[PDB]
Amino acid sequence: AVVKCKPTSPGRRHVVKVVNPELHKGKPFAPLLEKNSKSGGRNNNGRITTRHIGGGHKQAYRIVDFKRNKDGIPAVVERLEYDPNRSANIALVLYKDGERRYILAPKGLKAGDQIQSGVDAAIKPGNTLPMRNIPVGSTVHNVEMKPGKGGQLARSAGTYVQIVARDGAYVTLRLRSGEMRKVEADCRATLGEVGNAEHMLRVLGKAGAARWRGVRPTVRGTAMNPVDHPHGGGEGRNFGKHPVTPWGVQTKGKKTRSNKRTDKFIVRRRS
Amino acid sequence: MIREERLLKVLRAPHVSEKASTAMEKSNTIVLKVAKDATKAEIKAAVQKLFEVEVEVVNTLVVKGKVKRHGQRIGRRSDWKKAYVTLKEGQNLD
Amino acid sequence: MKRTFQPSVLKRNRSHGFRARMATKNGRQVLARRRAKGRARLTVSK
RNA sequence: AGGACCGAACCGACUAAUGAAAAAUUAGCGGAUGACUUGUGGCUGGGGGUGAAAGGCCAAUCAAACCGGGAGAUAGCU
RNA sequence: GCUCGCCGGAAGACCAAGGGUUCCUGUCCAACGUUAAUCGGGGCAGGGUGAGUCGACCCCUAAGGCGAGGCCGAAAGGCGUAGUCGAUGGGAAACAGGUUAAUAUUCCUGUACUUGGUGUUACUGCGAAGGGGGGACGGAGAAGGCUAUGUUGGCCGGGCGACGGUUGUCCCGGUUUAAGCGUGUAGGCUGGUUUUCCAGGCAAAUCCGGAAAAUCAAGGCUGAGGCGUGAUGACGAGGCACUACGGUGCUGAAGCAACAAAUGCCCUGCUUCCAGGAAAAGCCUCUAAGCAUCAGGUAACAUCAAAUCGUACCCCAAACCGACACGGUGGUCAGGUAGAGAAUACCAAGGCGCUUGAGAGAACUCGGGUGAAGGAACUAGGCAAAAUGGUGCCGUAACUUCGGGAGAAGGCACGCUGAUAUGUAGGUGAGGUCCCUCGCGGAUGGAGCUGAAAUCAGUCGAAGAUACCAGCUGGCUGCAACUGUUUAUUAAAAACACAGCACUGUGCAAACACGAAAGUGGACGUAUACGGUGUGACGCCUCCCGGUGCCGGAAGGUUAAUU
What we know:
This is part of a larger assembly, with chains A (271 residues), B (94 residues) and C (46 residues). Chain A has three domains: 1-113, CATH 2.40.50.140; 117-194, no CATH class; 195-271, Ribosomal protein L2, domain 3 (Irregular).
């Protein structure tokens, strides 16, 4: 649930917490863990390539299963877990053959729930089956775009996709963006919505909270000198130019999709 | 097993000093100058063969050379290896 | 006042030392240059 | 509980008067569990870096570092 | 040598880094030392650094670096796989005393430990580049158990006072002891043991994981401290022999108890929070190829082994970074009285008086003290000074986002002695007595020790938070919501950032950014996400598309290469 914190200090006043009691209070499943060091938004050349990244808390990498290939074995949900690496919540599941995996926790999922992947699998939340097997009009998440690759669409805290149509070898998806997209009908998808839907209701409430999430502060181009940004300079507050990136490209409207290879799959762009 | 020639080349000299004299008289320990490359076991072997005397143990150290000045010109003395060789009780050395 | 030079031997060697100079071309040229000049201390190396 | 309070260390540098000091002193001053501070090592290189942005900082040097070279640049000027 | 004075969370002690002989001894005083110099971190000569257990080396890896092939690139070269390097992190082992002019966990004395070989007898499944476990991990908070350490008493030794008193409830000093081995406690974690099966752990697995079934409630792991031993020892106040006045040799009492107590240890624990918290090896374990009655494994016992390098000295400084014998510099140690305290004052241990002195006692300057009467009249401005200053209790407005405002404001008490109470409330806790699955056990018990806070009565002073220390307060108002950041060295702000808001892009080989490219970041993320721009908590809100941009359209006009 969301929780407005009492204003016992400025910087706590405007805070809203998103508290799920059902998460695991404990150390995660260590076998599925692995190291994940921070970039600072800097590439192999050592240059900053994406500004405003830096610092934040040390995080491990949970090995989430997005490919979801344990066909026919039924699994049961052991617990839900906090993943620092994503807006969603993860679920530690236990297959009957003794293997455990992390999966995106869907909306209704909880400890004790049974889930299943496969063509034969049942059409219920958390189950995963090819979209030619999934009825039209259903909500799914963790959608593969290429068969066998692993889910790439609809992984964020409260996303999902609509299968609006199945026309032969393809099905047409309604993406969260509003973009309509063809996808091969043999690609895989998980039933239901992804879990942590009130994720958006949280409000950080202070500068430090943003820092905790590895976000360095943002300087406005207009606050700079001309040598730095197109917006710089001006005695007092001047802005007599069309908005642009630090690299001179228009920002308020100018489209930038250039991919002519996948134009065919886009049924309708978002609006 | 150390070669005789190497043994002979190990031992440079006895070291005379107050501390050395004290070590000799009290702890039955001789203070030698030895080759800088000479290891402890080597030194011991050489002691045993060339002075004909049982060794308990060898401690070694490296003495660094002093920087000196001959007139206006600066110049450094050689570094050299010192060895305290403790000799078995009752071992009297000439 | 913390002055610019804050010595550290390892850091000195890695930065300017012989092997570092050897590693890359340009360093090798520097070395060659210094040899030509007649430098007694070719590198920072003690 | 807290980018909570008072306050030493520690980090800073608002007022004041005054070469031991190429930016210090003393007296006061701000923060002091955090967007803190600090050691060791690492990475980013010059129209390039980094920048909670002051054209700041990049070895007492910055509206384009230093070293060497073109180079005895050119100087209707002194 | 005796006085005086200063530091004492340092101006003491020990290290790292950095320096590199500055260490110690003798000797010299030209130069160096802001003066003199017999002295010196100066000159010259000699001496000095001892390790299986400290550190490096070594095994393991992080960020990162290099990188066979490889991909890419006019050349140079870039990226990067396998790999290999890389500590600031993980990985076996030593303590006490004595000694040098100068080293010591390194020498000596005592008492230990480690992990390798080799050989043994005893046994008999060993075996990895592979599987599993472990190592292995955050912040804050709270206690409880402890010790370091300190105080008092007891004990032991010495003393009987340069001036009134001082054989006592008097004075001074000491009252220390390790690692190791044994015990396995306060406490923490977990249900154990056996059997059966199984699409999992790249193959196999007796291991892990998962299913069942049986049976017992104690099983294991961890763990400070204490106790015992170590120790008939060592050390020991000071006494006694020699004296090159430096010291050397002999000798040696007591060596207990209580209370208090860390920020250190149990604790890598427990509780809790969200921001969700290295890796690999060592270590344990499982098997595979293999080998097969051999090797290898574990078992004790014997022997050998532990190489190499560092070890002096300075290290908040006269030895490092600052041109100087001139501010900066990470870690560890942390006594007493008062105190909340690592603040402050005075002291201990220890270390210093800052390498020019001597006079004088003009102006003027600096740093301080006090000041009649006035009390901001000063001044751009109360700048600077002065003032406030503690604990407890009473009391406290507007406004408010109901948290605040608020230590609002303002007041009262405060010393010492006695009594309450030859020391209370509390804390601690010995004997005795009882229980007992027997121990570091549980009950009862209260000796002794410690010990606030209050009330009443008296008492001194001008003054009792007496020194050091230690808020000035209130009223209206602009700006910025707030904590933060900034022009290293004239600007700390109303500037930047901020949480929040909005627009816009981006469907993943994402947009974008660095890269002739390969590739990398974005992100091991996927529209509840990421990028860009503006605005900037919260509250109430928030006409013009002509111009320039952007988006969409494509009927016509115009229009490249080409032909």
